[PDB]
Write a structure and sequence with these properties.
Layout: E1 8-16, E2 21-27, E3 35-41, H1 48-61, E4 72-76, E5 82-86, E6 91-92, H2 93-99, H3 106-125, E7 138-142, E8 145-148, H4 160-165, H5 170-185, H6 197-205, H7 218-227, H8 238-254
Antiparallel strand pairs: 1-2, 2-3, 3-5, 4-5, 6-7, 7-8
Helix pairs in contact: 3-5, 3-8, 5-7
Bound molecules: the ligand Cc1nnc(=O)[nH]c1Nc1cccc(C(F)(F)F)c1.
Length: 255
């Protein structure tokens, strides 16, 4: 997986990552003389601590093979350290939804939820817990294809047991997925706008939940609400979410 730096032509900055800017570029490879790629960079990669955390993402992504999870292409492990990834040419999901708010039909939004559910059912099948499911970590490969894209706490997305006890499980991922579905159906609006991170848990404990997005199907909102059961053992698994989203999608496409 090590790639010679001379094989990479760094292009334009496409966005911001947790560790530094992400660029588009070209990988001039034996298999493909002009492969379009994304290049993740890391500020302060001279710190062993930071570099270990950065490159851990690449190690993680290398373990997965799924149509809706972004693929690792390789790494450059000399300063400045870079991770070379599959390029998703339509960019981050939140930006995409906000810009295309009035060009995306409901069927596409449900499709995106469904595709993410397929990725997360796959991770569940491997007993992998993601811990940070949110629209900010999803990328758009085509107008009909989204992918999970990325391996201070995201309190507004977290399950109550995660906030209270720092416990993350497959069940907490489902809660976060519920929030991510809400985000999609809200065209990339963040949950709990105007609320302080410290006041989120009080509202959750008081039985409050994110409201039904405008134009959201009732079957779909009901599914979200099931993801947000206080007791983790009452939340569905991703196999059930995927099946229900497929039926909802098909009902929408028949409309
Ligand atoms: C990991 C990855 N793989 N393929 C990509 O095409 N982009 C990626 N990451 C990423 C992270 C943050 C922001 C943005 C951007 F450019 F805004 F979309 C992209």
């Amino acid at each position: 997986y090590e790639i010679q730096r001379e094989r990479i032509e760094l292009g334009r900055c496409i966005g911001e990552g947790q560790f530094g800017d992400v660029h588009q570029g070209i990988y001039m490879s034996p298999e493909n003389p002009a492969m379009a790629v994304a290049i993740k960079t890391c500020k302060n990669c001279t710190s062993d601590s930071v570099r270990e955390k950065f490159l851990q993402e690449a190690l993680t992504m290398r373990q997965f093979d799924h149509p809706h999870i972004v693929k690792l292409i390789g790494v450059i492990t000399e300063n400045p350290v870079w991770i070379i990834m599959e390029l998703c040419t339509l960019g981050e999901l939140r930006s995409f939804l906000q810009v295309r708010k009035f060009s995306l039909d409901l069927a596409s939004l449900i499709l995106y939820a469904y595709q993410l559910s397929t990725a997360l059912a796959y991770l569940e099948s491997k007993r992998f817990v993601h811990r940070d499911i949110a629209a900010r970590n999803v990328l758009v490969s085509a107008t009909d294809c989204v992918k999970l894209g990325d391996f201070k706490l995201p309190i507004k997305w977290m399950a109550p047991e995660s906030i209270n006890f720092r416990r993350f499980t497959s069940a907490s991922d489902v809660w976060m997925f519920g929030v991510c579905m809400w985000e999609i159906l809200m065209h990339g609006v963040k949950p709990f706008q105007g609320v302080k991170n410290n006041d989120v848990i009080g509202r959750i404990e008081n039985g409050e939940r994110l409201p039904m997005p405008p134009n959201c199907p009732p079957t779909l909102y009901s599914l979200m609400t099931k993801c947000w059961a206080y007791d983790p053992s009452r939340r569905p698994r991703f196999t059930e979410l995927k099946a229900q989203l497929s039926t909802i999608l098909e009902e929408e496409k028949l409309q």
